């Protein structure tokens, strides 16, 4: 599934991401745009046996287990293919584990380099919510 920005925003707000640890909703939609380009089936192989999965590109060495990455910690305690769903619940619940405090969105390199410091609210203005 490739989401539209408003539809992803509404689904993210329903799963408790609006102002989660002080982060406004637009941050989360801007991160998904630059990480997966809003695709739930997005995958990225890295220069190490890790692969990043789904809408928020969650890493197979640390957060989900794919049974293929050397060293899997699996801290979200989830199989990586569960994150490739058109429903984003699993992906949001793991993201909430990753963001333990008000500086946790630095876990996504694209958010830090491309969203942080810009008008991320522009991604949700005019969406019904």
């Amino acid at each position, epitope marked *: 599934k490739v989401f539209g920005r408003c539809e992803l925003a509404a689904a993210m707000k329903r799963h408790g991401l609006d*102002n989660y640890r*002080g*982060y*406004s909703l637009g*941050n989360w939609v801007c991160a998904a745009k630059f990480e997966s380009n809003f695709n739930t089936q997005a995958t990225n192989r890295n220069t190490d046996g890790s692969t990043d999965y789904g809408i928020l590109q969650i890493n197979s060495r640390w957060w989900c287990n794919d049974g293929r990455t050397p060293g899997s910690r699996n801290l979200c305690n989830i199989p990586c293919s569960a994150l490739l769903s058109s429903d984003i619940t699993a992906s949001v619940n793991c993201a909430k584990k990753i963001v333990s405090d008000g500086n946790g969105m630095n876990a996504w390199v694209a958010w*830090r380099n491309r969203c*942080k*410091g*810009t*008008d*991320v*609210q522009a991604w949700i*203005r005019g969406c019904r919510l």
Partner: antibody
Amino acid sequence: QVQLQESGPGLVAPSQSLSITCTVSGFSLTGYGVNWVRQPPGKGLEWLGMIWGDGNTDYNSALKSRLSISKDNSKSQVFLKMNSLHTDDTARYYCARERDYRLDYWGQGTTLTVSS
Amino acid sequence: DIVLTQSPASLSASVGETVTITCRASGNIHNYLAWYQQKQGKSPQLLVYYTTTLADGVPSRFSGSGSGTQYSLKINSLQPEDFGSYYCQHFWSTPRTFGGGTKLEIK
């Protein structure tokens, strides 16, 4: 330690253009916006404008034609330039860091009096 | 431009009273509203952002509420250091504007 400190001329005649500097420390200007706010003697706060981490600027509707904000990321400085000065521009001017739609750290302000 | 109407202009109160300050927006600001305290001769200090969230270090006797267009700051059992001015500010697109201010003074 996040610090913002304003420096300005103190007194100006209508024939001059105002330039005020905000020197920041403890954070990068690429990751945060800086807003400029003023407060006339014994009055409330007035928003003047801002410059985002990416360099885009947005201004108060009424004052946009007289204002210009810019920054030098390596010097860690933000500048407010104002021209066509009127005595109602007499105020304390403040720069404040914006972090995700709240102004969490504020400078002490500089007082400016506009003369004849 | 969305304008904010803040009231009252002044409140006289004793220590230990609860008081409420309101800001009404001329258009929906979608919860992007912040409150600041300004002590005599000091910089404004952030108290509350996104309508309800306390800034780090603000005591829990401050609470914010509101939705759409009317918003409130309530101060329960106010203390000697709470006297000063209070301002609301919205962050829905640009230009941003401030409420006119409320002076909280000793009774």
